[PDB]
Structure formats: structure tokens, C-alpha cells
């Protein structure tokens, strides 16, 4: 049949698998990646942020980016044929259409890649755990690059696709949201650091409980249904070192699936919270105590001060459309500095 | 054997990019300011876009 | 020769990267 022939052709064993999912994935992936290169090489951010943003202007890989649209655009999808650019590609790039382009095509790209994981899994005949695990990263992208700005004033406050720009998004969320104080973010950190820990410790353990299946010092060449490393020896070792060890390989591998993925999901909850400015910014008890008692100080209050500094100074440069004017006498600062 | 067509096209594309920058066509295409076009004789401030639906007329000025 | 191709290509790449690094000290983005 027609559809059956389509399916047969799409699911052929090529050097690069395609599939139906490929129909969605490859165009959008290509366009997102390409838009990032195009923007970081040629397009500026002079009319949106008042910043040089491309190699053409003199940016390096660290300071170049595809910046967010102008704040005045709001949450406009900013179509090329939209009522803002009206077909004009130049004005489109000057407005910040490349950001929405990259974001949307990147989103549908992620959908397509997850669908690719599902499809290949089903075709081969495996359990779809790769896709689930990948639901993780998706949650990060959706919450941070879509939900957070949608909750805010405009796409302008969404992260700009670039190194130093992402750094800016970071310090922004610290100074304005006290993002480090948010328990969901703490769970995220737990997830990532725990993930890296698990990766390292599993790798090292397997590598150092290997069976002598060869004569060469190169143990790599010496590798079947037999386990290449001693699970019992590993168990013994970590039981006597750490007090507790794995005993079930299946549980182990699931665990080092679970930890990082969960991290990502939790931090995403947090970010939605910040989309509505529903922050974990303060501890009212300590603020009241400190208000009444000028001798009371914790690292929390110190960080509150730090946030205030961040906000002033950067506020003037990071939000040019606001026309913020802070005379040098109102800027918070300590003695001498 | 396959190095011929590549020896005729790869340098061609390389030079084409070079020319895309050297002729200054990139500036006109992506609306990227030249080193002398950030500030004019009339405006001394950052030319931010304030109107969403009238960004064309605003960018023209 | 494959190894000669890899060597030449590698030298070319490193040369372009070197030109970029030089570009960080000259022209735009050099603080000059």
C-alpha cells in the first residue's frame, strides 16, 4: 500500500535512520542549529539590547549569541510574515525573530527527537526508557525557554542562546529571584552532582573490578554472557569502605537513570514558580529579626545584600528599554568600594 | 579521485563566504551595524525598538 | 596517504583557529 510503502522506505536501515519521527525531527533540528550559527555569526542585538552579538561585530565564541527579542514585542511569536516584521527579513532579524525561530524549531525538534527514541525503540524491540530519561531535558527546555518568559513580561527575559548570555540569565535569576535559595533548584543540584558522582563511581568500580581475560596490560582488548567485572568483589569493597553497596545490577542502572532525570524535573518545578515571580526569596523570620535587631546577621542576609547590589547596577544596563536612571548617590554599596 | 570537484568547490565556497563579508553584503542582509553605524550624527543613544506593530517605521528612522 | 591527509588537514584547521586567536588581538573585539 501507499502508506505501507512510505513506512517501508522511511524505516530502511541507512547510515542515518529517518522514520516518520525523522520527518518531524530533521527539518526543525537543522533550522534551529543553523539559526544559531547564522545569528551568532552575522546578526546583531543593537536594536533589542543595545549589544554587539556576532562575530561580524567582534564577538568571540564566549560573548556571541542569538539574543532574545525586544521587550516591546511582548510574547509575540514573531513570524517572518507577522504584523511586526511584515515579511522584511532584515527588520525580522533586527526585531529578534531569530530567537523565536530557534526556540520554536528547537522545541519541535526536541519533540521529534523524543519521538525518534520511541520509534527506534519500538522497531528494535526495546523498552522506551531512553525517551523517558530524555523527558528530563525537555522539561528543562520547556520550563526555562518557554514557560518562564511566558510568565514574565516578554521573551526579552528568556535566556539568550549564548555562553555569556546564559551566564547573564544565571546571575539575573540569582539577583532577582534568589534562585540558589530555592529548594527545587537544590534538588536539581543534587540530581546533577549525584549523576556525575554515579557516572564516575560506576565507571571506576567496573574498571577496577575487571576479570583477567587476557595477558596484555591493555585490558580493553580482552572483551559474551559472562560478566567482565566481579560484582561480588565490588560489593565487598564498597560495603567495607562506604558501609553500603549495590547488589543488583538492574537496580543500579535504573538508579543512575533516576537521580539526574529527577533532578531536572524538580528544578523545572522551581522555574515555573519563578515564571510567576513566586520565589523562594526570603525567610520572613530572619528578615523581621534583622529589622528589629541590627546585630543579627546570617549568610542569608549577606546574600540578600548581594542580590540588591546585582539588581541595581545591572538593572540599568540589562533593561535598556526601561530607561532606568539611577544617580550614583542612590546605588547601594559599602564603604570605600 | 574525488578530490577534484572538491578542489573546485570547497575553495569556491570559502572565497564566497570571504566575499560575503568583504563586500559588506552581510551587513545589508542581516541589518548588522558597521563599526561607524552604531551612532549617527543625530542620535547619540541606543536605538531601541519601542513599537511592536510599527517596528519598520521606527527602524527606518 | 591517509596519515598525510590527516596531518595536512589538522595543520590547516589549527592554522584557521590560530587566525581566529590572532583576530582576538586585532581589529574588532581587540579593545584597540
Amino acid at each position: 500500500g501507499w502508506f505501507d510503502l512510505l513506512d517501508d522506505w522511511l524505516k530502511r536501515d541507512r547510515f542515518v535512520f529517518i522514520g516518520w519521527s525523522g520527518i518531524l525531527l530533521f527539518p526543525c533540528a537543522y533550522l534551529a542549529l543553523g539559526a544559531w550559527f547564522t545569528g551568532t555569526t552575522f546578526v546583531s542585538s543593537w536594536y533589542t539590547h543595545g549589544l554587539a552579538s556576532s562575530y561580524l561585530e567582534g564577538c568571540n565564541f564566549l560573548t556571541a549569541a542569538v539574543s532574545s527579542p525586544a521587550n516591546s514585542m511582548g510574547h509575540s511569536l514573531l513570524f517572518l510574515w507577522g504584523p511586526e516584521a511584515q515579511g522584511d527579513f532584515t527588520r525580522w532579524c533586527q526585531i529578534g525573530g531569530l530567537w523565536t525561530f530557534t526556540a520554536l524549531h528547537g522545541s519541535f525538534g526536541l519533540i521529534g527527537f523524543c519521538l525518534r527514541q520511541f520509534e527506534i525503540a519500538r522497531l528494535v524491540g526495546l523498552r522506551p526508557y531512553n525517551a523517558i530519561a530524555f523527558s528530563g531535558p525537555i522539561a528543562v527546555f520547556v520550563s526555562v525557554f518557554l514557560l518562564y518568559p511566558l510568565g514574565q513580561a516578554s521573551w526579552f527575559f528568556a535566556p539568550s542562546f549564548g555562553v555569556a548570555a546564559i551566564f547573564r540569565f544565571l546571575l539575573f535569576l540569582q539577583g532577582f529571584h534568589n534562585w540558589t535559595l530555592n529548594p527545587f533548584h537544590m534538588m536539581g543540584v543534587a540530581g546533577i552532582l549525584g549523576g556525575a558522582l554515579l557516572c564516575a563511581i560506576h565507571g571506576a568500580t567496573v574498571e577496577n573490578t575487571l576479570f583477567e581475560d587476557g595477558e596484555a596490560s591493555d585490558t580493553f582488548r580482552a572483551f559474551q554472557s559472562e560478566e567482565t567485572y566481579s560484582m561480588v568483589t565490588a560489593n565487598r569493597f564498597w560495603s567495607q569502605i562506604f558501609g553500603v553497596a549495590f547488589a543488583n545490577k538492574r537496580w543500579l542502572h535504573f538508579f543512575l537513570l533516576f537521580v539526574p532525570v529527577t533532578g531536572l524535573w524538580v528544578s523545572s518545578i522551581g522555574i515555573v514558580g519563578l515564571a510567576l515571580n513566586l520565589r523562594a526569596y526570603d525567610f520572613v523570620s530572619q528578615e523581621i529579626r534583622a529589622a528589629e535587631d541590627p546585630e543579627f546577621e546570617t549568610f542569608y542576609t549577606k546574600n540578600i545584600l548581594l542580590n540588591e547590589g546585582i539588581r541595581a547596577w545591572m538593572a540599568a544596563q540589562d533593561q535598556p528599554h526601561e530607561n532606568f536612571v539611577f544617580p550614583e548617590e542612590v546605588l547601594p554599596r559599602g564603604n570605600a568600594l | 579521485r574525488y578530490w577534484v570537484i572538491h578542489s573546485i568547490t570547497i575553495p569556491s565556497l570559502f572565497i564566497a563566504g570571504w566575499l560575503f563579508v568583504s563586500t559588506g553584503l552581510a551587513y545589508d542582509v542581516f541589518g548588522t551595524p558597521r563599526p561607524n553605524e552604531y551612532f549617527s550624527e543625530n542620535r547619540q543613544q541606543v536605538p531601541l525598538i519601542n513599537d511592536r506593530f510599527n517596528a519598520r517605521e521606527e527602524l527606518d528612522d | 596517504p591517509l596519515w598525510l591527509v590527516v596531518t595536512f588537514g589538522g595543520i590547516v584547521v589549527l592554522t584557521v583557529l590560530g587566525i581566529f586567536i590572532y583576530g582576538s588581538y586585532s581589529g574588532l573585539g581587540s579593545s584597540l
Binding site: 547510515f15 561580524l56 | 565556497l13 570559502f14 560575503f20 552581510a26 | 584557521v16 583576530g23 574588532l28
Partner: peptide
């Protein structure tokens, strides 16, 4: 699809490389 993909990535890569070099020589 091999040709389409390999060229899809490689052609613009070379284009862009030329462009950026040219940028290395743009003076203020």
C-alpha cells in the same frame, strides 16, 4: 540521504569559515 546530510552540514560550514576569517581582518 547520506549526500543530503553530509553536504547539508559541510557546505554551510565552509561558507561560514570563509566569512569568519574575512572578519578576522576587519579594522575599526
Amino acid at each position: 540521504f547520506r549526500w543530503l546530510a553530509i553536504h547539508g552540514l559541510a557546505i554551510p560550514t565552509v561558507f561560514f569559515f570563509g566569512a569568519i576569517t574575512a572578519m578576522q581582518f576587519i579594522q575599526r
